[PDB]
Amino acid sequence: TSSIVHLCAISLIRYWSITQAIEYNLKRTPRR
């Protein structure tokens, strides 16, 4: 299991700069 996490983490960072825009995006809104 721990082997997963591992893989996850790895794949997390690289996949970081996205979340930010996930929702926001999703929404957006703006808001505003």
Curated annotation (Swiss-Prot):
Q: Where in the cell is it found?
A: Cell membrane
Per the UniProt topology annotation, the Cytoplasmic ranges are 13-32
So which domain of life are we looking at?
Eukaryota
Residues forming coiled coils:
none
Q: What does this protein do?
A: Alpha-2 adrenergic receptors mediate the catecholamine-induced inhibition of adenylate cyclase through the action of G proteins. The rank order of potency for agonists of this receptor is oxymetazoline > clonidine > epinephrine > norepinephrine > phenylephrine > dopamine > p-synephrine > p-tyramine > serotonin = p-octopamine. For antagonists, the rank order is yohimbine > phentolamine = mianserine > chlorpromazine = spiperone = prazosin > propanolol > alprenolol = pindolol.
Linked disorder? Lipodystrophy, familial partial, 8: An autosomal dominant form of partial lipodystrophy, a disorder characterized by abnormal subcutaneous fat distribution. FPLD8 patients show selective loss of subcutaneous adipose tissue from the limbs, beginning around 13 to 15 years of age, and abnormal accumulation of subcutaneous adipose tissue in the dorsal neck and face, as well as in the posterior thoracic and abdominal regions. The disorder is associated with metabolic abnormalities, including diabetes mellitus and hyperlipidemia.
Q: Which family does it belong to?
A: Belongs to the G-protein coupled receptor 1 family. Adrenergic receptor subfamily. ADRA2A sub-subfamily.
Protein name, per record: Alpha-2A adrenergic receptor
What's the source species for this entry? Homo sapiens
Gene name for this UniProt entry? ADRA2A
